Amino acid sequence: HKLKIRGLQSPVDVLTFEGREQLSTPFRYDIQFTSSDKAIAPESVLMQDGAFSLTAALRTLHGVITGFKHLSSSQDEARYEVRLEPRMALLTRSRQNAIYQNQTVPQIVEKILRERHQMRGQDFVFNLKSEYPAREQVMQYGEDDLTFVSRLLSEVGIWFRFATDARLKIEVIEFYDDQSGYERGLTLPLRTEAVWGLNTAYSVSGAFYARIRHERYLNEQAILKGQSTSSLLMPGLEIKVQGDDAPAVFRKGVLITGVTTSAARDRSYELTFTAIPYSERYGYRPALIPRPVMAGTLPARVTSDIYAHIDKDGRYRVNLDFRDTWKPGYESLWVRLLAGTEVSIAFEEGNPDRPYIAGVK
Amino acid sequence: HKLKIRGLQSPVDVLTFEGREQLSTPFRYDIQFTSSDKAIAPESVLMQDGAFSLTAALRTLHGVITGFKHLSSSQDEARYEVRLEPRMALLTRSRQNAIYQNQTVPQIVEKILRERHQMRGQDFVFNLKSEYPAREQVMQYGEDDLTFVSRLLSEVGIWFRFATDARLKIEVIEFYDDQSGYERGLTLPLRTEAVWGLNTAYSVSGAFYARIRHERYLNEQAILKGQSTSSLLMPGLEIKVQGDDAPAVFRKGVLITGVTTSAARDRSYELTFTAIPYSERYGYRPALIPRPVMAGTLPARVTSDIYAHIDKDGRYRVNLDFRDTWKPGYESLWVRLLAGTEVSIAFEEGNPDRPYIAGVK
Amino acid sequence: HKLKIRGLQSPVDVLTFEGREQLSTPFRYDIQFTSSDKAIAPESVLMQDGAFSLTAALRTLHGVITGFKHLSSSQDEARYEVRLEPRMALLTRSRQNAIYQNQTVPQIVEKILRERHQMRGQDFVFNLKSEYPAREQVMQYGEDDLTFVSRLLSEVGIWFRFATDARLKIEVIEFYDDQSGYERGLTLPLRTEAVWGLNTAYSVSGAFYARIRHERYLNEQAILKGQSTSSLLMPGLEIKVQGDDAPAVFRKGVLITGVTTSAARDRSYELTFTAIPYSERYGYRPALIPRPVMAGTLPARVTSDIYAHIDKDGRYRVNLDFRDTWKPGYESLWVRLLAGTEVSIAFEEGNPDRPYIAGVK
């Protein structure tokens, strides 16, 4: 196992690591290492590019260094820890309010990626099978970019995984909405690279929304688990098992939804995985991130020059920037004389996408 | 220890178990077992009846199988787990909005039991000492049936336990509101069946509501704990201790509020219990389940033909079904011309039982 | 280690203890002891004064006994536990609604201390460097006194620590807002009293509010940790380390923000500490306690005799006591004919300090 952090002169020798990967969430890897340098400075490491590999060259994680710890010091070395996350994790660092106008969910997501985060088409790709309606207005309020994006994708049942661009040496976010996004198709073993410890758990547009919400129920109705030494095994992969003392579902084919991941100099590579059965009548769907709850009222100013900007439904266009908490040109809201007047905006059942005027101040 | 699941041909041999019982909450038992059948299918087990006994025949838990796990497989056997809960636990599976009209808390609770859950008079029994007022309107909004029912009972300080019908072979919910619901009266031992490890912890209509809320404070002011091998020891039982190296409270008499419960083929039966002192000036009271917080507004339609249905307080009768999220005939609300008109319903301090018109759309 | 609880005849012999101290929060010490008395009664102990010392006389914690446990009994002794907290912790026991009129944050805090809690100038001291504006109205709603006070201090970035009055034998709350509140200046060791196990972690009026919120970001950007046997080491202390195999920050000087603390008869004294670097361009700032979220509306009565109490902004003075949930003379609110009339009070974006009339009942 190797860890390369760009610009770092200090030798990096991997002691131990713990990793977590899961569909529709950015991965996280806490990597311990030793170095002859007993004073690696956080500034040399934080926000730098990082690459973490399993050596045979087998699989690499590309990302940024989010956290840095100096753990201890000996006579001749020091112990350190770094957190390696993809660049997508950095969307948690920005939380501005915005109203997005006439977009589909993907277009909003692509905007958030490209505008605030400088991501560039090589950094992500959409392979959606379904078609997504334009939404008239979509509000982001009191939500970091990651939460906002993940909520929008989950409500409509789009999911993502990370993949590696061999040439560019970067991680790429790939979005999908159906089973044609699954990667086929390894066949392990039981138990060189193999599978073992297999176990199961079972518990008890539109339209569309009813279809997505049913597939999500089916998702959490059947959890498949197991253990492995395969360095190829990853979220997004559809695998099957040789067996044949393995349960029936694992012989049909299972879709890996998650892995927990580990090694040390005296232990080496083992992973536990979560999974769901392959099926032709449902697909993977992420957990629904709850909507923000809009209690109380928002002040706004009616805009125009100077009678009222009012379209063929009335339906004022209202402006709610006062505190630069609003993204530029994303402050304006179409809502149901006077008009430079201050109004109160309320939200039907706390829903940010059902605003109305309450409300004149 | 025996586990019988109705309809199951596969032999069931109990490996290990962990159980939890507590007043005013449905019990939960995770039971591991081995079987010669290396492919018990979830469909043979989920939603089937289950009975779990301590053998001398000593005590049985009746309920349904909620969860199923295949844990591992050997050459000749497989290891499995099931979750055994009473039928009441299944009230968590239904979450419809409803307004209940002119009922007492017990009548509402009985309705929820009988209507949506097919429970039949043998399945539950009320032995209340206090008298409960009819409530004009009571709203269930964004709450599963279990949460709703438990909240209503707790706000008024009614509690329940489970008991066994020997003849019918079923679990029975028994509701009570005072000390005459306690079952008397075992006397253990210290330490064949006995008690040990005794310990204490002390920390720092109406009317009525002040009386209930005081008794609840007294409930959490004095926690009594201990360990036992008695298979008879259960929530709801009032027991006393022989001693006499046991603290004073345990000699007076204690009411068992909860037990955690365990055995294995190489360990056998032990339980830890929580408890409260017997007293004549207070009784058991469950934890208060918080009210749902009504932020924002609910749309409604004023009904009539066609001027307004309006009684001698005005006070419109309003209808808020649009999305079959409302129980049939439970969609209508009496609230303080025009009238097929759409209004906004708001709630005084977020309370679902204080609605008013805000609010004309 | 000695524990004295006022009025207690039963001999107290300290078995083991676990303690937690941290800036801007009341300390907590769970202290186990043995006694020849096999029936110490909770009433002899709860709410009594308690003093806990490290013997050389080295450092004492003064406070009250909040919790009491009888753990076990032998032939000749019994094991007990007590929780020792300062008197400030008792502010969690009172939760009344109140509107404070024309005060600074410190004056409100001093009021809460003196009025409801009988604290007397010897019990606390303010040494603020910054000047704090009078606030016109400040609402406490659905918040215990501790949460309320801590929220107000944190929003403005005031912090506190506890100190001992040698003569009076009491704990004293000391409030500060800058680096001149730090106590200088021990110099340990590495490793009689010393330091070891040093480690770091780094992650990724006004005006004023932007300045406070930036210093708070810097606070959680760099966590310094370590271990020690010093009985002098405490939150509030600025210490430095001899080294010099110790990292650079620890040689500059670090401010102790927190300690976890332990001993036993067979182990004795060790503490882990958290800390932040000394700096001249930022200071310690506590975590921001979130504001209560005001969903729904509050009923109020317009007061006067009898036309309307209305000052030169209009701007009614409104009264919202109905249920003695309001502190005496703290029920009245200045808010934007008729007037003994009942109104509805709403809150702009759920903020308790932005009330307006919605709203006529």
Q: Read off the CATH number of the domain in which B109 is found.
A: 3.55.50.10
The reply to whether omega before B185 is within 30° of 0 (cis) is yes
**Cα-to-chain-centroid distance, residue C153:** 9
Q: Are A345 and A298 in contact (CB under 8 A)?
A: yes
Decide: B223 and B256 in contact? Cβ < 8 Å.
no
User: For A17, phi and psi rounded to 5 degrees?
Assistant: -145, 155
CB–CB of B354/B348 below 8 Å?
Answer: yes
Contacts of A248 in chain B (CB under 8 A): 39
Provide the resolution (angstroms): 2.6
The runs of H, that is alpha helices, within A115-208 are 145-155
Which letter does DSSP use for residue B326 in this model? B
Specify if C284 maps to a domain: no
Say whether the peptide bond before residue B314 is cis (omega within 30 degrees of 0): no
Residues A73 and A190 in one domain: yes
**How many domains are there within chain A?**
4
Residue C57 DSSP label: -
User: C235, C21 in Cβ contact below 8 A?
Assistant: yes
Q: Which tokens sit at C267? A: 């182990």
What is the number of alpha carbons within 13 Å of residue C340 lying toward its C-beta?
A: 2
In chain C, DSSP finds a helix count (H) and a strand count (E) of: 4, 22
The residue of chain B with its CA nearest to that of A352 is B296
- Chains in touch with A (≥3 Cβ pairs < 8 A): B, C
What residues does B256 pair with on adjacent strands?
Answer: B275
Question: With contact defined as beta carbons under 8 Å apart, do C177 and C158 qualify?
Answer: yes
Last residue of a domain, one of B236, B252, B279: B279
Subunit contact C346:A72, Cβ cutoff 8 A: no
Strand order in the sheet with B170-176: B124-126, B170-176, B159-165
Three-state DSSP at C108 gives helix
DSSP state, residue A56: -
Chain A residue numbers touching B350 (CB-CB < 8 A): 295
Asked if C52 and C94 count as a contact pair (C-beta separation under 8 A), the reply is no
Q: Which amino acid is at A135?
A: R
The C-alpha of A199 sits at a distance from chain B's nearest C-alpha, in angstroms, of 5
Alpha helices in chain B (DSSP H): 105-114, 145-155, 209-219, 248-252
Asked whether residue C290 is domain-assigned, the answer is: no
Three-state DSSP at C111 gives helix
Half-sphere exposure of C75 (CA within 13 A, CB side): 0
Residue A286 belongs to a domain? no
Min CA distance, A200 vs chain B (Å)? 5
- Indicate if A29 and A138 belong to the same structural domain: no
CA A88 to chain centre: 7
Token readout for C12 is 């107290």
Nearest CA in chain B to C75: B245
Residue A260 counted as domain residue: yes
B264-303 core/surface letters (b: 16 or more CB in 10 A; e: else): eeeeebebebbbbbbeeebbbbbeebeebbbbbbbbbbbb
Cβ-based neighbour number of residue A57 at 10 Å: 9
Cross-chain residue pair B295–A350, CB shorter than 8 Å: yes
Residues of B with CB under 8 A from a CB of C: 197, 199-204, 222, 245, 247-248, 293-296, 346-351, 356, 358
Long-range contacts of C70-77 (CB under 8 A, 24+ apart): C70/B199, C70/B200, C70/B247, C70/C40, C71/B199, C71/C32, C72/B197, C72/B199, C73/B245, C73/B247, C73/C38, C76/C36, C77/C34, C77/C35, C77/C36, C77/C38
> Taking CA B203 as the corner, what is the angle to CA B198 and CA B207, rounded to the nearest 5 degrees?
115
**Could you tell me the CATH number of the domain that includes residue B336?**
2.40.50.230
Sign, CA torsion C110/C114/C116/C118: positive
Provide the residue range defining the domain that includes B211: 206-221
Q: At what angle do helices B145-155 and B105-114 cross, to 10 degrees?
A: 160
Q: Report CA dihedral (A340, A343, A349, A354) to the nearest 10 degrees.
A: 0
Is residue A195 packed enough to be buried (19+ CB in 10 Å), middle (13-18) or exposed (0-12)? buried
d(CA B234, CA B188): 13
Q: How far apart are the first and last CA of chain C?
A: 63
Q: In angstroms, rounded to a whole number, what is the distance separating the alpha carbons of residues C247 and A39? A: 7
Q: Which amino acid is at A186?
A: L
Asked if B68 lies within 8 A of A199 by C-beta distance, the reply is no
Torsion of CA C330, C155, C27, C130, to 10 degrees: -100
Contacts of C268 (CB under 8 A, 6+ apart): none
**Is position A284 within any domain?**
no
B16 within 8 A of B32, measured Cβ to Cβ: yes
CA distance A295 to A298: 9
- Of C199, C222, C346, Cβ closest to residue A297: C346
Same domain for B1 and B143, yes or no, is no
3-state SS, one letter per residue, for C81-101: EEEEECHHHHHHHCCCEEEEE
The neighbour count for residue B133, using CB atoms within 10 Å, is: 10
* Spatial contact of C252 and C246, defined as CB atoms under 8 Å apart: no
- Which subunits count as partners of chain B given 3+ CB pairs below 8 Å? A, C
Q: In what order do the strands lie in the sheet with A124-126?
A: A124-126, A170-176, A159-165
Nearest to A42 among C202, C348, C356 (CB): C202
User: Do B176 and B127 form a contact (C-beta atoms < 8 A)?
Assistant: yes
Q: Residue C206's CB: how many other CB atoms inside 10 A? A: 9
> What does DSSP say about strands B183-188 and B237-241: parallel, antiparallel, or unpaired?
parallel
Chain C adjacent subunits, 3+ CB pairs under 8 A: A, B
Q: Which residues contact residue A241 at a Cβ distance below 8 angstroms, ignoring those fewer than 6 apart?
A: A187, A188, A189, A190, A195, A198, A250, A251, A254
The CA distance from C24 to C286, in Å, is: 7
Residue ranges in A11-104 assigned as alpha helix (H) = none
CA dist A302 → A334, A340, A345, B358 (Å): 10, 5, 11, 22
For chain A, what is the radius of gyration of the CA atoms? 24
Residues A333 and A318: beta-carbon distance below 8 Å: yes
In this structure, which amino acid lies at residue B116? R
Token readout for A153 is 């994708």
Instruction: Output the six-digit token pair for C234.
Output: 């405490």
DSSP states of A240-266? EE--SSS-HHHHH-EEEEEEEEEEETT
B70 within 8 A of B38, measured Cβ to Cβ: no
Determine the 3-state secondary structure of A218 from DSSP.
helix
| Closest residue of chain A to C345, computed from CA coordinates | A296
Residue B42's closest chain A neighbor by CA?
A202
- H/E stretch holding C200 reads strand C195-202
For A309, counting Cβ atoms within 10 Å of its Cβ (0-12 exposed, 13-18 middle, 19+ buried), the class is middle
Residue A31 main-chain phi, psi, to 5 deg: -120, 115
Tokens 């480690």, located at residue: C199
Contact A194, A233 (CB under 8 A): no
As given in the structure block, the two tokens for residue A173 are 């976010």
Question: Which of B197, B247, B348 has the CB atom closest to C39's CB atom?
Answer: B247
Q: Is residue B289 part of a domain?
A: no
Q: Say yes or no for a CB contact (<8 Å) between A202 and B47.
A: no
In Å, how far from its chain's centre is CA C50?
19
Q: Which of A233, A249, A279 is the last residue of a domain?
A: A279
Whether residue A77 contacts residue A97, with contact meaning beta carbons closer than 8 Å, is answered with no
C75 and C111 inside one domain: no
Do C108 and C177 fall into the same domain?
yes
Facing residues of A69 across strands? A81
Question: Which residue in chain A has the smallest CA separation from B45?
Answer: A202
Do residues C175 and C154 make contact, with C-beta atoms less than 8 angstroms apart?
A: no
Distance CA C321, CA C335 (A): 15
Q: Which helix (H) or strand (E) holds C333?
A: strand C332-335
Integer angstrom CA distances of residue B317 from B137, B295, B301, B307, B335: 12, 22, 9, 12, 6
Q: Across the interface, do A348 and B47 touch by the CB < 8 Å criterion?
A: no
Mutate to test the interface with B, among C37, C47, C64, C73 (most CBs of B within 10 A): C73
Q: Which helix (H) or strand (E) holds C2?
A: strand C2-5
Alpha-carbon gap, residue C205 to C122, rounded angstroms? 30
Single-letter residue type at A269: Y
Alpha-carbon distance of A75 to A205, in angstroms, equals 65
Report the alpha-carbon distance of residue A276 to residue A222 in Å, rounded. Answer: 6
CA distance B173 to chain C (A): 34
| Secondary structure of residue A145 in the 3-state scheme | helix
Residues B253 and B307 in one domain: no
The answer to whether residues B216 and B358 belong to one domain is no
- What count of Cα atoms within 13 Å lies in the side-chain half-sphere of residue A100? 21
What lies within 8 Å, CB to CB, of B107 at 6+ separation is none
Comparing CA positions, the residue from C228, C272, C270, C265 lying closest to residue C16 is C265
With vertex at residue B84, the alpha carbon angle to CA B82 and CA B86, rounded to the nearest 5 degrees, is 160
Residues C274 and C309 in one domain: no
The token pair that represents A275 in the structure block: 């999974």
Q: Are A267 and A229 in contact (CB under 8 A)?
A: no
Q: How far apart are CA C356 and CA C300, in angstroms?
A: 11
Q: Give CA–CA dist A245/B307, Å, rounded.
A: 73
Q: Which of A199, A245, A351 sits opposite B296 (nearest CB)?
A: A351
Contact C325, B213 (CB under 8 A): no
Question: What is the nearest CA distance from C355 to chain A, expressed in angstroms?
Answer: 10
**For B297, which of A202, A204, A346 is closest by C-beta distance?**
A346
CA distance A206 to B158: 42
How far is it, in rounded angstroms, from Cα A82 to Cα A64? 10
Residue C356 within a domain: yes
- Between CA B201 and CA C80 the distance in angstroms is 10
Q: How distant, in Å, are the alpha carbons of A219, C57, C58, C166 from that of C53?
A: 57, 7, 7, 12
Neighbours of B212 (CB within 10 A): 21
CA nearest C162: which of C143, C181, C140, C144?
C181
Measured distance CA(A160)–CA(A236) in Å, rounded: 9
- Cα–Cα distance for residue pair A222/A203, rounded to 1 Å: 7
Whether residue A336 is contained in a domain is answered as: yes
CA atoms within 13 A on the CB side of C328: 2
Q: C179 near C157, Cβ under 8 Å? A: no
Burial class (CB in 10 A: 0-12, 13-18, 19+), A341: middle
Q: Please indicate, yes or no, whether residues A62 and A190 belong to a single structural domain of this protein.
A: yes
How far, in Å, CA of A77 to CA of A9, rounded? 15
Are residues A143 and A165 located together in one domain of the fold? yes
Q: Are residues C68 and C111 in the same domain?
A: no
CA distance C65 to C80: 13
User: Is residue A187 located within the same domain as residue A177?
Assistant: no
CA angle B155, B160, B164 (to 5 degrees): 170
Rounded to the nearest 5°, which phi and psi values hold at B25? Answer: -150, 145
Cβ-based burial of B318 (10 A; exposed 0-12, middle 13-18, buried ≥19): buried
DSSP lists the bridge partners of residue A333 as A318
CB–CB of C296 and B348 under 8 A? Answer: yes
SS3 track for C136-180:
EEEEECCCCHHHHHHHHHHHCCCEEEEEEECCCCEEEEEEECCHH
CA quadruple A35, A38, A43, A46: dihedral sign: positive
d(CA C110, CA C104): 10
